Design a protein around this ligand. Structure first.
Ligand SMILES: *Cc1c(COP(=O)(O)O)cnc(C)c1O
Ligand SMILES: *Cc1c(COP(=O)(O)O)cnc(C)c1O
Ligand SMILES: *Cc1c(COP(=O)(O)O)cnc(C)c1O
Ligand SMILES: *Cc1c(COP(=O)(O)O)cnc(C)c1O
Ligand SMILES: *[C@H](C=C)[C@H](N)C(=O)O
Ligand SMILES: *[C@H](C=C)[C@H](N)C(=O)O
Lengths: 390, 396, 390, 396
């Protein structure tokens, strides 16, 4: 005998329903359909005994809008809990700060996001933490490289920007047998395509800036924890380091998450067609997209990717860095020559100009492409024009 | 041509316009999104260089609002666009601009309730004669045009009956009679119908609904087909001080980018839901342009592009009390509330919600029967929505 | 036996306390010290019978953040109720739309804000409403000019930009004896200096853009009603015309109202010193400020102005429009050559270039000055430099 | 020089800097306030023209945040400033930048609780030795400096004991020993004390408190005296991803304009309240720099400018239970909560609120007695605040 405002008892809401409504109910006070923005720093306590009786005290620790977004994200990624941060780098740094001490070993994918690599090497290594960067394409490599001091195995799939894949289920089985903490950066994937916590990962790190936002609008990070122990560790350290997400950013992201399925579907269809076009282009050397049949890790993509193969692709222009640069300089609108990725607006970039950067795969004129939701024919027209000008 | 430029001579296709139309990266910084000009006034370089940078006071115009207006004018296919705090403000500005004492205005009988009230309870006090006719037959509009008729205000689809109006034929009539044709295509969105392409002189939009699509902001838009009409709307907006804020314009610039995919999802869900309802035994009638039982299917196929929309309606067997039992028992993800066109599916019964004010006689005359229910379909999983509707109908 | 969160029974809180806290209590749900921003359009209803049981349904009609700001403003101005609008012009237009019909007469100060004058003449007169503009400096003039069709007496004090004063108590006595509705635009005054509702006015119109905001940040208007009848009329017509203030603007203004007393005190002290300096300046023809002893309506200023004489002044540069324009072009920072007024930033303007405009008093080179809260010596230095360059 | 330019060779005075410092009207539009760059990335003109407009990714830097940082560097008298999501983030970035395993850091014993915890519960795990000493005597700092000491972290006034530290003498000591002097002047604000003027190498601010002053946003600031220190802070902020958002920076750019008048009002109210409390028979002790009973009055008059601040403290006769009875019975306009420095007056008792965690022994050693109460004075009418305090003391 449920009424309006209640969910059907015994019904797990479907995926897109969760993206629309998950972790959010109408405001109890007013019935407001959207969460009010709690743009305030402190919360008045009713008494000394009733301290935190309403759950909040100070926004660096917790905020109702941020908490609503966290519950939504934990539900979307299938974790016990989630903590939101000012940036994705803040989330990664909070992971490294919480679960690594002097003497600890940490295995990181050698093709990780450049910021993750630089924060590990340039900063955290000063604390006598050993970061070893290996190829995660073969999970057996991860199994070999585990030492007794290994505390964290940090995977990324697909990797920024090489789009190399890591077998999250195999790596998670290895890590659970070896009793080492498995952290996965599924920013490029989005939970719509892959939920590492479903594949056995201990922690998921997300740059909500990318696809959670998907509108080039905010910065944010998320750490989704599978257990209460891990989540409490992360919550405590976030309060200590003061890198929590703001309420306004939480509101923006709560709005933009609702359309993540349709956004990612459109971006991925456009990306498939664009990668197919680039693979046929006489001016294009190599094309990297998990959806085209020549993808080297095709079997792992088909096993690990749900619904889509994503909006990220890459390609090499025949002619080296000079042809690549000429092409970059001659890409017209609606393409944008900038950084970031995962947004409605299609983005093109060249990490080589924006030895150490070829063993990764960021070769000469290696162009990274974030596909948006514009008309795919306009995107292909701009690409074709630029390629003919290369 | 180098990077950052559109290829000369080419035009962005539809969804490209929704993403990028009327907005370029910030010339000062390259910011891919337009900054939010949350400021009242603009410093002038000198007395002689007054307005040399185009701005002076945010009530008159604002850069964020202007970027949104360029986008909206591009999407709707008009010369210009002016943005307002609400859709009602856009309608009210139209009425205040183009009507005077002694003028005549043709309004669709099944117009949006707010339009009907604001014409009846307010502007009629200015000795302006408002006549509410059935716009379903363009000859009704043609016959009812007086020599004092200045504005013909169509709405398609209508709120909430979803009646259609032949915008092309009505525009032909108005052009031949030299009468302004204003069309409220809020329920249609420009992704399904652009009245300016069909000869309408003005389009009024409640950006609150689908332009937003997230239950986030209120807004309105007036898209003008000529420079003279646009200049009049601009002047009157400045005079009446009902411009849209820069924060709302930023929100709308964000949400408009996904309008095509949002509306495609809502329309697919609405088609499936209408087909489900047209076979439930507790349902007396189902209105959706995408099902064969639609009375104006010919006009719908002639006038609707891509989709048939995310709005539908249905009449429950059992009258008002059965409708109320269903409303009180419609579960989540549905929301019992007003507004429409959002990602969150919304259901309402105007009889005892929107029009618990109104007498039942002309409420039936205006089409809204007793068990009439308006349904805005969101982008949730259609199975959750259908299960909710089925349980609610079980309780009817 | 009151506890934390309650006010002392039988205590009317003092003025500055009302500016800080009036119309706002901690959020009942979370104890949040500031009102959450209800950035949502619709409000979910619990049932058909319990329609509007929580008070809200649609934001064009009403919004909790806007409602909180309205209660605060009604308390500050001493009225039964208040309605907030997108702009001050929207508030004035709502007044004219509600209380004027074809055939009605309306007395307006001839020195009213230019926007009020233009909306009355250019627009509302098309509805066969007669707007008569007379000199409100003598209340007897208002008494003479009242016809049987006069419905609204629309005063302004101080006037934009001539700073002419209108005797609100005398005009209100006249209007109450004649049974005509008295509306007052006290934007230049702020309730800290004058509350027309205390002086018998029927309606107060405020441009919250000016001093309520005081930070050049938002646009807004307010209509403060002395009776429930008037307030309900205004509320209904605001819902009809769709010119309500947004929740974000309400939040901004709720923040900026807290410092209105100290802001206006600082602006007014700076303005007094600046007007005294200008009155001694050999390059300055006339100086207009209600605080200097030569003010023509000095007695009315001392009778009607509380605490301060405001941050608005005006002056004429000796030499006509050419000297005025040279001075305007040679005013350095921190002065800003723009429009608007009442902000932290000091503003200078010349309405003559930014016959019909001299009977008002906007003479040749008539400079309007909005004084901010910068260091008064910097403001005087910039003015002195500009004047020597005139 | 024409309009819109500062007179060359002149410097704005204090309050002028608070209003206008480091911000000019928008070059594109003349917008008197800086627009809100609510955008993640910035479009580049070409490969060669990378960063030609100064921006690329908002985590690294953002135009609104940069305008706020210019303002803050001007106000505090530093070379540069970097803004963070919180004050704790600024402190944590300092610790992460300038400390390494085996390094030594001198921290005031009566430091802010968050600083104490983050040094003790986190960075000490990196084999960094944190020593908490009494900063009230600069010779204590001088004697305790090891050859491995890299940072000396002062706080003045201290939270919540309001102990002062001689920033000039400590800075002299640190310069002679070539040690970084970081000072947390959150409680002071630059309107009362600017540690960079007193030889400090770094100032850390919780902009949440007085910079905001409206209980609206969280933020932090690191103001660096040299280019090298500033560049290190900038690099590490980019690496740790704890930059301040553009909306928060806009709010803070708004609120900083009234910091002088706000702090003057709070300080006048605090003086009157301290004088009232120093004569209430239910009050055992009163700490405020502006009353004669202040233990460090000489340093206060030497080091405090304009005012003595809006923070005070007092110990109630009767112990913790009397303090709790007073806390539960302090009426509006007071608010029982955390945070400080806002327009709204705030009262707290760390013993059973902030430090219901802590053991009582070292909580007394760190100065906070049992009936200790911290009071942030707002800008309400001082009579309302005094009446509230008097009633609450009646209930003690
Ligand atoms: C962008 C990104 C990050 C960094 O997140 P920010 O919000 O920019 O700090 C980390 N990992 C991946 C894969 C990313 O794409
Ligand atoms: C919503 C609507 C309006 C009114 O717009 P508001 O934003 O609510 O003021 C007018 N016409 C239609 C068809 C509408 O749907
Ligand atoms: C500014 C002003 C107005 C107009 O208010 P807006 O917010 O600009 O629409 C009306 N009257 C006076 C006295 C004003 O100063
Ligand atoms: C508030 C404060 C902090 C912490 O700043 P947050 O914004 O709360 O992270 C650090 N030191 C002092 C003195 C403080 O008052
Ligand atoms: C009008 C009243 C809220 C609105 N557009 C609706 O249809 O609900
Ligand atoms: C720390 C904890 C909330 C904060 N700055 C305070 O002093 O309350």
């Amino acid at each position: 005998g449920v009424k309006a405002g209640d969910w059907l008892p015994g019904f797990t809401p479907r995926e897109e329903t969760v993206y629309v409504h998950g972790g959010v109910e109408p405001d109890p006070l007013t019935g407001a359909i959207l969460p009010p923005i709690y743009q305030n720093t402190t919360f008045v306590q009713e008494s000394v005994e009733n301290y935190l009786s309403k759950g909040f005290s100070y926004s660096r620790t917790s905020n109702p809008t941020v908490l609503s977004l966290e519950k939504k994200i934990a539900e979307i990624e299938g974790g016990f809990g989630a903590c939101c941060f000012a940036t994705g780098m803040a989330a990664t740094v909070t992971i490294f700060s919480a679960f690594l001490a002097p003497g600890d070993h940490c295995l990181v994918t050698n093709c990780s996001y450049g910021g993750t690599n630089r924060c590990a090497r340039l900063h955290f290594s000063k604390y006598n933490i050993d970061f070893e960067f290996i190829d995660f394409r073969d999970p057996t490599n991860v199994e070999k490289a585990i030492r007794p001091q290994t505390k964290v195995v940090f995977s990324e799939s697909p990797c920024n920007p090489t789009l190399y894949l890591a077998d999250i289920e195999a790596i998670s089985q290895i890590c659970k047998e070896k009793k080492v903490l498995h952290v996965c950066d599924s920013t490029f994937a989005t939970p719509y395509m892959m939920r590492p916590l479903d594949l056995g990962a201990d922690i998921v790190v997300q740059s909500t800036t990318k696809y959670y936002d998907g509108h080039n609008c905010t910065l944010g990070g998320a750490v989704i924890s599978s257990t209460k122990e891990i989540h409490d560790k992360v919550f405590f350290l976030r309060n200590v380091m003061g890198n929590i997400m703001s309420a306004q950013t939480a509101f923006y992201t709560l709005l933009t998450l609702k359309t993540l399925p349709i956004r990612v579907e459109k971006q991925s269809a456009n990306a498939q067609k664009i990668a197919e076009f680039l693979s046929k282009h006489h001016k294009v050397e190599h094309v990297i997209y998990p959806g085209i049949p020549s993808f080297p890790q095709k079997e792992l993509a088909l096993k690990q990717h749900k619904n889509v193969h994503g909006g990220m692709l890459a390609f090499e222009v025949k002619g080296g860095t000079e042809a690549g640069i000429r092409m970059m300089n001659h890409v017209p609108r609606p393409w944008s020559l900038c950084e970031n990725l995962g947004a409605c607006e299609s983005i093109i970039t060249c990490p080589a100009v924006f030895e150490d950067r070829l063993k990764v795969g960021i070769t000469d004129g290696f162009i990274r492409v974030s596909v948006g939701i514009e008309d795919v024919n306009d995107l292909i027209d701009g690409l074709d024009y630029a390629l003919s000008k290369a």
